[PDB]
């Protein structure tokens, strides 16, 4: 099966790419696996595959860390993400995001039901498993639980059957047969949970599939629209109907090649302690436990020699940056365009801890609008910060056509030089805030409201007559024939490869 | 003579360091020399010494580019700056800034007058030179003149004789015997010019010395206090009295080993076209010429085989970043401490285009103050933004003790994660602004006023009970013995030198 359609094949692809380190000696899921993976993510090293996990039994489980993290070389920096999507490993971020957006103006391709698959190779009923006995990792030393769920896909369906959502949300082991995790507004797992709660009659049928098709875990991390079934979006994106098998204990459908599947219910009534967890912004607040949603596990099925993916998340760079930030940015780009805003490109700079999105403006179109910074900033901020796709993002930076928003150095240059603090900004206090940013949930103001800004790094003439500067750089401050002469003579004079 | 005391010896030191490329074939001062130097600065390459400059005659002149720019390796990144100061080439930025601050609580060591020096080896009276005939560089293609003066020291003295100021301010050739340049508030050359203008009786006696002692050009770029003669500050810093020779046509004194000296007058009445110039923030605005100060040159003296230093300034990284930013930051650190603010360290991140200064706070002392963010931000901003040392800086970022302000990645992390936009900031509109930032002089608001902000990236408990988080990073999220095991097994497992 292709790598984008089968996690086991993805792992093979990383090996073949010389992007995998297989560790066949014993590794402790208590901190060791995650510490290795953390160092990988901080150094852009090869992804670790832990084949000999202390506490692995009867096939549950090996661990793959850093599934969506960065490679060291610039030429294939995003190669692991490209391998989720059947793209060449040298694919640009623009190409990756365009792939992820491509299904937005395609008919869905609904999934195909098949009678069995590798995920059915083994099973454990409710007398045969204990979640506390599995090699679930402790990912950070101060975490409030062992976070089994950092890179699986939650599957829940609206009561009426018409929307089946796939998404990543964290969860930790609570006891032998329950997890606790985040189920929070405005997320689709929350929206569906609320529909079941209002109906009031039962707990939400649920499954959690680990080691799903890579193209599916990317859509799981993307804020595609309300009411849109991810499986059909992924089918359109990849041009193929995804193969799904029915759960044994409920009527949800899981990817046929899932590594590990948990079946059960998400409670409409019960909660339990959840957190703290070392999170995407780079912090943990030891002892900050709060009540989270509670899941009951009734059944586990799994592949022979099952592999659990894991995100050892925190400071730069891991899946919470590469996937959360970038995929939100993609959706924001599209949202802006659909609201007739002249946005060509969007990206969440890593340097911002993916709390900013830089929006590249087609300034020719801007000029035709005959508008001003105050007006335009307000329009952009109302569109984005009143939408779910803007949830995680606290600062939008508007930049003109000369800035490559996928290059953080250029975004920082434009922000620092073109946006006058205060005057060129509009604050948004009556929007939903992202509480996990420390300045929000651990800050001076309301955790859930406000704290957002539009920073306009467009220069005044970009609204009127056009750019009226040249950069004071090698590229723009010297004629073409001179530049080329300097480059051609560079090593001959005594001064100092793309792939590497 | 030592490298820090003699520019010719500095050039030798760069050669010996394998930090120099001598170009002995003809190079055009019309853009070519500056284009090479620009590429050096953008790549952190070796400094270029142009020994064969098209238009060089009778010894005037060779060019050294990138005198204070960065080296590629992390271990000696600031080595060129260290070589200005007799420090080891591996000196940290903290060590460099501490050296530059060291004379602030020392008695000055006044200069020593000597009867002659190398700067007298050759001379040209007012019938024998023409500034338009020298190989003065065109540094950027859109510049409004040939900027002779990018790394020389202006020497002017108060009418009463009690303060002799040394500073860098740009200047360009106006005609055969005049320059135009910037003389602007609150700069000391401006302050002294205003004293002469109020007296009204004559033009200001002036000299411009190029290729001065490196330790002197660093103090020339630093905002040491009003009324403090730089020569005595440099004497204290280096522990030696600087050797000076009298000008031939006036009673000012210039460094004995200056490469090139211009003697003349700075007009109290006349101006002429000046600019545009490709500047420190990375831009030029073609055609933006304005009236600048006008200097008359009466005499040139120079060393045999004279070398003119040149800054090809613009986008990162050159002397306008390494010296302007860092040295302002140093002075701000001291100013804060002298106003009883608990600031341990200051640096202008390069990523900010040296428009920010990050201020590291001793949070134990902060806690003892029993204050709040609003109050503290206001106090810090009033001290810094009402002082000349704060002139160039538009954003101050307050960070706690865990952040290394000399590491831009950590400053950006703390800013993005710990300072809530709006709420955790105080805007300053009634302070002097730096007009050369594009959002100021080419922006939406007053060019000379406002646009400043204090951003508080201290977390709430840093004011009260202490830091209440751990980073979600390899360093802080795992115990010592585990970290060490991972590191010790790193290459053995299959994963990937300080000097490089
Ligand atoms: C890639 C990724 C996405 C996480 C995520 C992680 C990763 C690795 C973790 C597990 C390591 C840490 C926490 N995460 C959560 C999360 N969203 C959320 O509601 N709660 C989470 O706990 N997200 C983001 C969420 O997947 C995106 O917001 C999706 O848009 C949600 O899908 P939906 O639009 O269908 O609601
Ligand atoms: C290192 C450096 C410093 C420049 C400078 C440059 C460099 C290379 C240039 C020449 C390449 C571009 C422009 N510069 C000017 C400048 N200050 C100023 O008033 N006008 C200038 O034109 N400065 C900053 C000035 O030297 C510092 O603000 C000093 O504190 C001034 O000394 P003072 O405190 O004695 O007034
Ligand atoms: K999703
Ligand atoms: K602006
Ligand atoms: K000075
Ligand atoms: K704060
Ligand atoms: Mn969804
Ligand atoms: Mn001075």
CA distance A361 to A344: 6
Other CB atoms within a 10 A radius of the CB of residue A322 amount to 26
If one residue of A194, A227, A324, A332 were mutated to test the ligand 1 pocket, choosing by the most ligand atoms within 8 A of its CB, it would be A324
CA distance B189 to B33: 29
**Closest C-alpha among B71, B78, B70 to residue B98:** B78
Nearest CB partner across the interface for A478, out of B31, B355, B496: B31
**Method of structure determination:** X-ray
Across the interface, do B473 and A279 touch by the CB < 8 Å criterion? no
DSSP designation for B392:
T
**Closest C-alpha among A44, A3, A69, A35 to residue A143:** A35
Q: What does residue B254 show for φ and ψ, rounded to 5 degrees?
A: -120, 155
Strand pairing category for B343-347 and B356-361:
antiparallel
Nearest CB partner across the interface for A459, out of B313, B395, B438: B438
- Give the bridge partners for B47, in sequence order: B20
- Give the bridge partners for B268, in sequence order: none
Task: Determine whether the shortest distance from the Cβ of A210 to ligand 1 is under 6 A.
Answer: no
CA of A25 vs chain B CAs: smallest distance (Å):
9
Other CB atoms within a 10 A radius of the CB of residue B285 amount to 20
Contact with chain B for residue A285, Cβ under 8 A: yes
Length of chain A: 500
CA of B266 vs chain A CAs: smallest distance (Å):
29
Q: What does residue B461 show for φ and ψ, rounded to 5 degrees?
A: -75, -10
Across the interface, do B469 and A439 touch by the CB < 8 Å criterion? no
Q: Is A230 annotated as a binding residue?
A: yes
- In sequence order, the 6+-apart residues with CB closer than 8 A to the CB of B319 are B66, B67, B68, B69, B151, B221, B311, B313
Residue A411 and residue A349 in contact, taking contact as beta carbons nearer than 8 Å? yes
CA distance A38 to A29: 13
To test the contact with chain B by mutation, choose from A477, A489, A495 the residue with the greatest count of B C-beta atoms within 10 A, namely A477
**A 417-456 residues inside an 8 A Cβ radius of B:** 417-425, 427, 429, 437-440, 442-445, 450-453
Per-domain boundaries in chain A: 1-330, 331-459, 460-500
CA dihedral B18, B24, B27, B32 (to 10 degrees): -10
End-to-end CA distance of chain A: 30
Across the interface, do A420 and B444 touch by the CB < 8 Å criterion? yes
CA of B269 vs chain A CAs: smallest distance (Å):
31
Nearest CB partner across the interface for A279, out of B31, B437, B472: B472
Q: State the distance from the centre of ligand 1 to the C-alpha of A223, rounded, in angstroms.
A: 9
Strand pairing category for B164-167 and B153-157:
antiparallel
Q: Is A332 annotated as a binding residue?
A: no
Contact with chain B for residue A120, Cβ under 8 A: no
**Closest C-alpha among A52, A6, A9, A8 to residue A29:** A52
Angle, helices A326-338 vs A93-101, to 10°: value is 60
Nearest CB partner across the interface for A417, out of B353, B445, B471: B353
Task: Determine whether the shortest distance from the Cβ of A312 to ligand 1 is under 6 A.
Answer: no
The chain B residue lying nearest A356, using CA atoms, is B416
Strand ranges (E), A51-152: 62-65, 112-113, 122-124
CA distance B157 to B254: 12
If one residue of B38, B170, B194 were mutated to test the ligand 2 pocket, choosing by the most ligand atoms within 8 A of its CB, it would be B170
CA distance B199 to A274: 75
Q: Is B165 annotated as a binding residue?
A: yes
CA distance A246 to A205: 13
CA of A309 vs chain B CAs: smallest distance (Å):
19
Contacts of A490 in chain B (CB under 8 A): 39
Give the DSSP per-residue string, A413-426.
HHHHHH--TTTTEE
CA distance B420 to A384: 18
Residue A257 and residue A213 in contact, taking contact as beta carbons nearer than 8 Å? yes
Q: Is A169 annotated as a binding residue?
A: yes
Across the interface, do A281 and B417 touch by the CB < 8 Å criterion? yes
**A 133-152 residues inside an 8 A Cβ radius of B:** 140-142
- Helices (H), strands (E): how many in chain B? 14, 22
If one residue of B139, B154, B187, B388 were mutated to test the ligand 2 pocket, choosing by the most ligand atoms within 8 A of its CB, it would be B187
Contacts of B459 in chain A (CB under 8 A): 438-439, 442-443
CA distance B240 to B245: 16
Angle, helices B373-385 vs B326-338, to 10°: value is 120
| Structure-token match 């993510």, residue found | A41
Other CB atoms within a 10 A radius of the CB of residue A104 amount to 16
- The catalytic residue positions of B are 279
Residue B27 and residue B33 in contact, taking contact as beta carbons nearer than 8 Å? yes
Q: Is B142 annotated as a binding residue?
A: no
CA distance B405 to B401: 9
Catalytic pick among A243, A259, A279, A331: A279
Contacts of B33 in chain A (CB under 8 A): none
Across the interface, do B477 and A442 touch by the CB < 8 Å criterion? no
Angle, helices A480-493 vs B32-43, to 10°: value is 70
The chain A residue lying nearest B493, using CA atoms, is A23
Q: CA neighbours within 13 Å on the CB side: how many for A362?
A: 13
Let me know if B480 is exposed, middle or buried by CB neighbors in 10 A (0-12, 13-18, 19+): exposed
Residue B387 and residue B348 in contact, taking contact as beta carbons nearer than 8 Å? no
End-to-end CA distance of chain B: 30
**A 321-380 residues inside an 8 A Cβ radius of B:** 351-353, 355-356, 373
The yes-or-no answer on residue A274 being catalytic is no
Residue A444 and residue B420 in contact, taking contact as beta carbons nearer than 8 Å? yes
Q: Is B170 annotated as a binding residue?
A: yes
CA distance A454 to A105: 28
- Give the bridge partners for B367, in sequence order: none
- Give the bridge partners for B29, in sequence order: none
CA distance B123 to B412: 52
CA dist A95 to A13, A359, A395, B168, B370, Å? 20, 17, 24, 47, 52
CA distance A368 to B373: 43
Q: Rounded to the nearest 5 degrees, what angle is found at the Cα of B376, between the Cα atoms of B372 and B382?
A: 155
Residue A278 and residue A250 in contact, taking contact as beta carbons nearer than 8 Å? no
Contacts of A23 in chain B (CB under 8 A): 493-494
């Amino acid at each position: 099966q292709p790598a984008h359609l089968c996690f086991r094949s993805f792992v093979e692809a990383l090996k073949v790419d010389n992007d995998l380190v297989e560790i066949n000696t014993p590794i402790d899921p208590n901190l060791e696996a995650a510490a290795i993976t953390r160092r990988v993510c901080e150094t852009n090293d090869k992804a670790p595959l832990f084949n000999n996990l202390i506490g692995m039994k009867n096939g549950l489980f090996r661990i793959l860390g850093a599934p969506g993290s960065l490679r060291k070389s610039s030429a294939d920096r995003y190669g692991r993400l490209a391998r989720h999507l059947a793209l060449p490993p040298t694919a640009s971020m623009r190409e990756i995001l365009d792939k992820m957006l491509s299904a937005s103006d395609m008919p869905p391709i609904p999934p195909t039901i098949v009678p069995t698959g590798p995920c059915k190779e083994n099973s454990l009923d409710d007398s045969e498993f204990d979640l506390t006995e599995l090699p679930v990792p402790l990912i950070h030393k101060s975490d409030g639980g062992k976070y089994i769920q950092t890179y699986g896909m939650h599957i829940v369906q609206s009561p009426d059957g018409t929307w089946t959502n796939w998404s990543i949300a964290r969860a930790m082991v609570h006891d032998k047969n329950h997890l606790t995790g985040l189920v929070i507004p405005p997320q689709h797992i929350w929206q569906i949970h609320q529909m079941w709660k209002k109906e009031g009659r039962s707990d939400v049928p649920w499954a959690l599939a680990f080691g799903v098709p890579p193209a599916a875990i990317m859509a799981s991390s993307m804020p595609i629209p309300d009411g849109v079934t991810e499986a059909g979006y992924v089918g359109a994106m990849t041009g193929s109907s995804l193969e799904l098998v029915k759960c044994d204990t409920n009527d949800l459908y899981v990817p046929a090649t899932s590594e590990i599947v948990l079946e059960g219910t998400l409670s409409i009534s019960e909660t339990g302690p959840e957190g703290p967890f070392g999170e995407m912004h780079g912090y943990i607040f030891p002892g900050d436990t709060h009540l989270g949603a509670k899941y009951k596990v009734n059944r586990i099925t799994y592949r022979n020699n099952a592999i659990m993916p894991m995100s050892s998340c925190g400071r730069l760079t891991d899946e919470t940056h590469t996937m959360i930030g970038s995929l939100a940015a993609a959706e924001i780009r599209k949202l802006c365009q659909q609201n007739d805003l002249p946005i060509t490109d969007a990206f969440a700079p890593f340097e911002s801890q993916v709390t900013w999105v830089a929006l590249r403006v087609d300034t020719e179109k801007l000029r035709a609008m005959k508008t001003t910074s105050e007006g335009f900033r307000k329009r952009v901020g109302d569109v984005v910060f009143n939408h779910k796709a803007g949830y995680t993002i606290h600062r939008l930076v508007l930049v003109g056509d000369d800035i490559d928003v996928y290059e953080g150095k250029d975004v920082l240059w434009a922000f620092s030089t073109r946006c006058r603090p205060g005057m060129d900004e509009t604050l948004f206090e009556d929007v939903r805030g992202f509480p996990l940013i420390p300045y929000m949930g651990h800050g001076n103001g309301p955790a859930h409201r406000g704290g957002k800004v539009v920073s306009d790094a467009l220069m005044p003439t970009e609204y009127t007559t056009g750019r009226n500067w040249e950069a004071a750089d090698f590229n723009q401050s010297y004629p073409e024939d001179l530049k080329q002469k300097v480059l051609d003579n560079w090593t001959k004079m005594g001064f100092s490869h793309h792939h590497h």
